[PDB]
Amino acid sequence: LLDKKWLTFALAIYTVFYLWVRWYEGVYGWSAGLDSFAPEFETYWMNFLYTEIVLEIVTASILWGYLWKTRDRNLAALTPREELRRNFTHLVWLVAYAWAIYWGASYFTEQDGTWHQTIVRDTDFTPSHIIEFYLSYPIYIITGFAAFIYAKTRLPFFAKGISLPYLVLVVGPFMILPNVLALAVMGTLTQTFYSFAQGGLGQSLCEAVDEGL
Amino acid sequence: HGEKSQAAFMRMRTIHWYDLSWSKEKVKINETVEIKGKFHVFEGWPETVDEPDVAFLNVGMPGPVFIRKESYIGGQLVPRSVRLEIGKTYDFRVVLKARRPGDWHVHTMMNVQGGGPIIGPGKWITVEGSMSEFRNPVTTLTGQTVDLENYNEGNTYFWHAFWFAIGVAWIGYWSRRPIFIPRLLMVDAGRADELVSATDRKVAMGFLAATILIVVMAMSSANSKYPITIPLQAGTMRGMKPLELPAPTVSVKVEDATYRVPGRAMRMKLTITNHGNSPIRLGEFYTASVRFLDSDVYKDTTGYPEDLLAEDGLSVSDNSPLAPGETRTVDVTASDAAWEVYRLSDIIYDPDSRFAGLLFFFDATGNRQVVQIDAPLIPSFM
Amino acid sequence: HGEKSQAAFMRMRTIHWYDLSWSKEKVKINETVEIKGKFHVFEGWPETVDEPDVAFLNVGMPGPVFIRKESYIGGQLVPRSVRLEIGKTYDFRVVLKARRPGDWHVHTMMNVQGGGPIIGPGKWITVEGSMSEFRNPVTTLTGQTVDLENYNEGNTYFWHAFWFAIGVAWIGYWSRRPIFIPRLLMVDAGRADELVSATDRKVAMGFLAATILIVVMAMSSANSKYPITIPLQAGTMRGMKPLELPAPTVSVKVEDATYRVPGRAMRMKLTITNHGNSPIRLGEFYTASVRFLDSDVYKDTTGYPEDLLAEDGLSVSDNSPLAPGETRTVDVTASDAAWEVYRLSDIIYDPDSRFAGLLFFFDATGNRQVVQIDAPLIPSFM
Ligand code: CUA
Ligand code: CUA
Ligand SMILES: [Cu+2]
Ligand SMILES: [Cu+2]
Numbered sequence: 001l002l003d004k005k006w007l008t009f010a011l012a013i014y015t016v017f018y019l020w021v022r023w024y025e026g027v028y029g030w031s032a033g034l035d036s037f038a039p040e041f042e043t044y045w046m047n048f049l050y051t052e053i054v055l056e057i058v059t060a061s062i063l064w065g066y067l068w069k070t071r072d073r074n075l076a077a078l079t080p081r082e083e084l085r086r087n088f089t090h091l092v093w094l095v096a097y098a099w100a101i102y103w104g105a106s107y108f109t110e111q112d113g114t115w116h117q118t119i120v121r122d123t124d125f126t127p128s129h130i131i132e133f134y135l136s137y138p139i140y141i142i143t144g145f146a147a148f149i150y151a152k153t154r155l156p157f158f159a160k161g162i163s164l165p166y167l168v169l170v171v172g173p174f175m176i177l178p179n180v181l182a183l184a185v186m187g188t189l190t191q192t193f194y195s196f197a198q199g200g201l202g203q204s205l206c207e208a209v210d211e212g213l
Numbered sequence: 214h215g216e217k218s219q220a221a222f223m224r225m226r227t228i229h230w231y232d233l234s235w236s237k238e239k240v241k242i243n244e245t246v247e248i249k250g251k252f253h254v255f256e257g258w259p260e261t262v263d264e265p266d267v268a269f270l271n272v273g274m275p276g277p278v279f280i281r282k283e284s285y286i287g288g289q290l291v292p293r294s295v296r297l298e299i300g301k302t303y304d305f306r307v308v309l310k311a312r313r314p315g316d317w318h319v320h321t322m323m324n325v326q327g328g329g330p331i332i333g334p335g336k337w338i339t340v341e342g343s344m345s346e347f348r349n350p351v352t353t354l355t356g357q358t359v360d361l362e363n364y365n366e367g368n369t370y371f372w373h374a375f376w377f378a379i380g381v382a383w384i385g386y387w388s389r390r391p392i393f394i395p396r397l398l399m400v401d402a403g404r405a406d407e408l409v410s411a412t413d414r415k416v417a418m419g420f421l422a423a424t425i426l427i428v429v430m431a432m433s434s435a436n437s438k439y440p441i442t443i444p445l446q447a448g449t450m451r452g453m454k455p456l457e458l459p460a461p462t463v464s465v466k467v468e469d470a471t472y473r474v475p476g477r478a479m480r481m482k483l484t485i486t487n488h489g490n491s492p493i494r495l496g497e498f499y500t501a502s503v504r505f506l507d508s509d510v511y512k513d514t515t516g517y518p519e520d521l522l523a524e525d526g527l528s529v530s531d532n533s534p535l536a537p538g539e540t541r542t543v544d545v546t547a548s549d550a551a552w553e554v555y556r557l558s559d560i561i562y563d564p565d566s567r568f569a570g571l572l573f574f575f576d577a578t579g580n581r582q583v584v585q586i587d588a589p590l591i592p593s594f595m
Numbered sequence: 596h597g598e599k600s601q602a603a604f605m606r607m608r609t610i611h612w613y614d615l616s617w618s619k620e621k622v623k624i625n626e627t628v629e630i631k632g633k634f635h636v637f638e639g640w641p642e643t644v645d646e647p648d649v650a651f652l653n654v655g656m657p658g659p660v661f662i663r664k665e666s667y668i669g670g671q672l673v674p675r676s677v678r679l680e681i682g683k684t685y686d687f688r689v690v691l692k693a694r695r696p697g698d699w700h701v702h703t704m705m706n707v708q709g710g711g712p713i714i715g716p717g718k719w720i721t722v723e724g725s726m727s728e729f730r731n732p733v734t735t736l737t738g739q740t741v742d743l744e745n746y747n748e749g750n751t752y753f754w755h756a757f758w759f760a761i762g763v764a765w766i767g768y769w770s771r772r773p774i775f776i777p778r779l780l781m782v783d784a785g786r787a788d789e790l791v792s793a794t795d796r797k798v799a800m801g802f803l804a805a806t807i808l809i810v811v812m813a814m815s816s817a818n819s820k821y822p823i824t825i826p827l828q829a830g831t832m833r834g835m836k837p838l839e840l841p842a843p844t845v846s847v848k849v850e851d852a853t854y855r856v857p858g859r860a861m862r863m864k865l866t867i868t869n870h871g872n873s874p875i876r877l878g879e880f881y882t883a884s885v886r887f888l889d890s891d892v893y894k895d896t897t898g899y900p901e902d903l904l905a906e907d908g909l910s911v912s913d914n915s916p917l918a919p920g921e922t923r924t925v926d927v928t929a930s931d932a933a934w935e936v937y938r939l940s941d942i943i944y945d946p947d948s949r950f951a952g953l954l955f956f957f958d959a960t961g962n963r964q965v966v967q968i969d970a971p972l973i974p975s976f977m
């Protein structure tokens with residue numbers, strides 16, 4: 001009933017996964033990950049790459065595939081009671097996105113930043129590149145899409161549309177690449193906020209302000 | 214680490230490192246290891262690498278597993294960038310203090326201005342001990358002696374926490390109240406402005422005045438302690454003293470030079486011609502950190518990295534003494550796995566198939582002549 | 596005026612000016628004053644000042660209180676910018692004609708390309724007389740002799756007034772009528788186009804054709820008188836003849852050099868070592884236009900600017916004759932208000948605490964040797 005700790009999954013699923021990763025490189029950063037022309041790189045690090053790309057195409061196809069087919073066909077008449085439950089789960093998807101972005105755009109990014117300072121790169125495929133570019137980014141993009149689709153397929157307001165700011169939010173990362181804009185999130189919240197208040201205007205939200213609160 | 218992947222001809226024709234020496238192979242935390250040697254900036258510097266007008270004498274390691282206590286090109290201490298001059302040879306000396314226990318492949322590298330870290334040979338050095346043992350003491354012109362490992366650490370932290378807290382304090386103050394969906398709607402139908410009012414706007418200027426106040430107080434408080442301070446010292450050192458080399462007594466001429474694809478060896482047809490007066494023999498060809506020796510003629514003692522030293526890698530069709538006044542053409546082959554391991558064989562992907570090295574000749578009583586060769590190097594497949 | 600506020604190390608390590616002389620101290624309008632001397636471009640030129648590939652030999656004064664009649668680097672007249680070469684010494688000669696009555700602090704300065712006026716020492720010169728006396732005559736390859744003070748003045752004025760008048764004439768024609776609030780409203784409700792009509796559009800093309808006409812008439816009339824004209828002569832002069840200096844006989848070595856903060860003096864410990872064959876003494880340390888002398892040894896007669904000449908500013912711990920072959924270490928102290936007045940003391944704000952100067956040594960029979968020193972200069976506070 002209402003909004004569950006299906007959320008606790010969303011927060012810990014990345015946290016555990018990425019903390020395992022940080023350990024994993026932590027031990028093989030030095031050992032294998034220094035000289036790329038050693039055969040221990042083609043096993044502990046290169047194989048890691050091929051594994052993830054494949055896992056990402058797959059889970060992406062499954063995750064988007066799933067939701068697009070379980071798209072609510074008879075959306076026209078379903079209760080405000082669930083138009084809330086769903087709105088909340090949507091918000092969990094966004095928490096999952098934001099968390100996923102944190103790891104990608106802040107964590108592993110400025111980490112790669114440090115890595116460059118300490119060893120001259122042997123490949124465009126350093127450990128922190130295998131993790132920063134081809135693990136971290138696909139993940140938050142997949143999370144991104146998921147959320148978008150969930151909203152489009154699960155909530156009116158979002159269905160019959162394609163939100164601009166939301167589209168921009170989700171595909172934006174596809175036009176972010178280095179050497180040698182994600183604020184859309186606002187627009188898309190101010191939306192999800194309205195989405196919450198269709199029946200849930202009441203209020204509070206204008207009634208129980210003019211009184212207690 | 215990081216050579217190997219970089220263009221084979223860049224590595225051949227950029228900086229030649231020789232007479233390298235390392236004072237120790239194994240060292241305790243806080244102990245010193247001293248790297249010495251010479252480097253020549255190759256006269257035929259490639260295009261495409263900005264001339265070393267502003268270069269920096271760096272060290273090739275995985276971070277501060279050592280700290281660089283001192284570095285010297287010519288006689289002079291070199292903490293800045295320095296202007297090196299094409300064609301010239303210099304002697305350098307790096308002095309490293311050990312900081313992190315482990316096995317490090319330390320290189321001596323040049324950092325050049327416009328495109329390129331120019332990485333010299335790397336040698337494995339082992340640090341034993343505990344990082345908790347490391348000290349980096351330094352005495353100021355101000356009286357005090359501090360440890361650079363931790364100096365000013367607590368200060369840094371305080372000021373960041375303090376300000377960070379105040380940032381939180383501000384959002385905190387506003388977030389006692391509800392944040393989004395009521396405040397959003399209030400703005401919508403009808404006016405906002407019930408959402409904020411002094412005592413809100415008193416706190417607003419409380420913060421605003423408090424902030425300017427604390428900044429200026431803090432600053433001239435930081436000026437009270439620490440009244441003697443300089444700006445970051447910077448700026449390229451010119452006038453690097455180059456090494457005065459005697460004109461070489463041998464001259465060589467490279468007629469064709471080929472390599473097998475795929476292979477582990479480079480052949481070249483040299484006309485060695487011995488001016489000056491003592492029977493001379495060829496003992497080494499140095500090419501891209503990789504050193505090929507005729508062990509019938511010369512033997513490394515400096516403990517040059519084992520993966521880069523080809524003990525009898527170099528074979529001369531005729532390496533009998535070359536009498537003074539005499540001049541002969543000879544077929545020379547530099548051969549060793551290092552040619553494939555360090556990817557000099559990757560010259561076949563380079564847009565400029567030209568090599569460059571140093572040959573080392575030795576007379577009877579064992580004093581040496583260094584001539585430098587460069588030429589186009591041509592593949593042969595069939 | 597303008598040095599002093601510029602970075603003390605730029606002033607130290609950029610161009611050194613010596614053997615300066617001024618033909619006169621007081622001068623009548625239309626009279627000549629000639630500045631001579633030598634300058635060295637310092638081998639350790641800073642980063643940050645583009646090398647003097649395109650430099651200009653200027654004069655530091657408050658506008659044309661003099662005019663520059665001639666200027667010479669090497670033998671050559673230098674009315675363009677010139678390429679000077681780092682390391683080299685040149686002799687210059689500037690020739691000034693006096694134009695405005697007064698007291699002028701005249702400097703000799705170099706103008707450099709990328710960032711910087713490089714200002715030499717300034718001397719006060721006094722011009723007596725009337726500005727109404729000043730003539731700048733010049734004979735052309737075209738026969739005529741004109742006065743540059745007023746040449747082409749009236750012409751300039753006429754054409755400007757004439758065209759300015761026409762400008763007014765055009766607005767004046769339209770402003771006989773009412774300009775704004777009626778015309779604005781006519782455009783508004785209903786159409787404009789009653790606001791303009793030939794005879795308006797006759798006048799329009801009257802002006803239009805008359806303008807094109809007068810321009811072309813005037814131009815080929817200006818071509819008729821003055822049929823012989825060249826383009827502005829420009830372009831950097833290469834091949835500046837540098838001075839051929841004899842290799843110095845003394846060599847010095849700077850081991851530490853310190854300055855007191857705050858203070859008026861710089862100490863340095865030199866190892867002076869006298870090769871060549873006559874007992875040598877130290878007479879002068881020139882640093883940044885400031886000259887410190889040991890009057891025990893040398894006396895300026897050239898009337899070097901009083902505020903920059905420290906008559907016994909230089910003290911040597913031991914300035915007895917230094918025998919040929921002998922070498923000694925000596926403590927030297929340059930000391931004078933000029934060090935604080937010309938703000939060399941402000942080196943403490945510079946991001947490169949390194950100085951540079953010239954030492955002048957004199958043997959028994961009064962002939963001299965110039966060595967240049969540079970080194971880091973380190974503050975001491977406690
Ligand atoms: Cu690092 Cu070899
Ligand atoms: Cu300008 Cu004296
Ligand atoms: Cu070389
Ligand atoms: Cu000089």
Ligand SMILES: [Zn+2]
Pocket residue numbers: 112113116129
């Ligand atoms: Zn990167």
Ligand SMILES: [Zn+2]
Pocket residue numbers: 238516
């Ligand atoms: Zn060894």
Ligand SMILES: [Zn+2]
Pocket residue numbers: 620898
């Ligand atoms: Zn006088």
